[PDB]
Amino acid sequence: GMRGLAVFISDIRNCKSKEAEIKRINKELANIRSKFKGDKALDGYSKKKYVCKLLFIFLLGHDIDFGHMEAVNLLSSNRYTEKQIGYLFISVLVNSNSELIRLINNAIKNDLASRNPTFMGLALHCIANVGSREMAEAFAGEIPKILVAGDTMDSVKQSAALCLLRLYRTSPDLVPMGDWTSRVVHLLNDQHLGVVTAATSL
Amino acid sequence: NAAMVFEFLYKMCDVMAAYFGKISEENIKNNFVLIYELLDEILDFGYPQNSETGALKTFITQQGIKSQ
């Protein structure tokens, strides 16, 4: 469980007119800025709490322009929850940067070189929920490599089908038609039923 | 008569201001019956009858809700 979010949102909800809310949110932003700069904030859980608080600050209706490198740093972790929060933050906040996009692509490429459905599914959701030219360029030939008749679980198969759908919807010219059509077509006859749903959509 | 409608609207605005202060969503919502009674009394069949405060007080028995 997480303790900082409960108290933070509880405080910010039962607030007065926008003046008090703005004062509280700016105080929290200053506190999180001080915590991010220096100090012994190497613990992953503290970064989790700060990133979640900042995400709620953004979703409340205020603009956020910092706390992005320290948030994409969460991806390189073994804890599932940290990866989930990092992927959610990347999906919610999108910025056009050279080093940041390259780092995100490297993290996702490392993620896809795994052997568990959870990490692959999270990476696929991160790819498909935003969409970008860089993601399509660096993963045009990787999603079909998942969808091809390899030893993959059903959930990652559905995720890959929908991710390829999204990439084709956003990057039509970057999707080939190699020797995987004969696999996707026969994938529609596969067992399970959600897999048939994703294959039918694609 | 074009000016008569505007004059009647101004008189109704003054009556509402004297009754429950400034016109707001909450004041209108909380005083539906008062508003219906006021429109029934001040106006009938389209003839804007007298809207004097003394004359309107006798014909109106509803009291509005005030929220400051």
Binding site: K16, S17, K18, E19, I22 | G21, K22, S24
Partner: protein, 72 residues
């Protein structure tokens, strides 16, 4: 904060004495030196009838330093 300065002096003859000018400092602080503090600021409008709490209010203090002289 502590600053230690060693000032070499020319031989000279006499009557210099450095004239002992005062110590001058420049600063600004986020509070009123006179102690003035805003207690309340309410805006009431009878016609429009908007809530006073809905008015966004920002109050900040900047106390500039004039001639801050300390004899030495």
């Amino acid at each position: 904060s502590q600053i230690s300065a060693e000032i070499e002096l020319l031989p000279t003859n006499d009557k210099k004495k450095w004239a002992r000018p005062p110590i001058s400092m420049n600063f600004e602080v986020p509070f009123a030196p006179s102690g003035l503090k805003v207690r309340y600021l309410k805006v009431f409008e009878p016609k429009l009838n908007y809530s006073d709490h809905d008015v966004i209010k920002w109050v900040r203090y900047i106390g500039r330093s004039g001639i801050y002289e300390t004899r030495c």
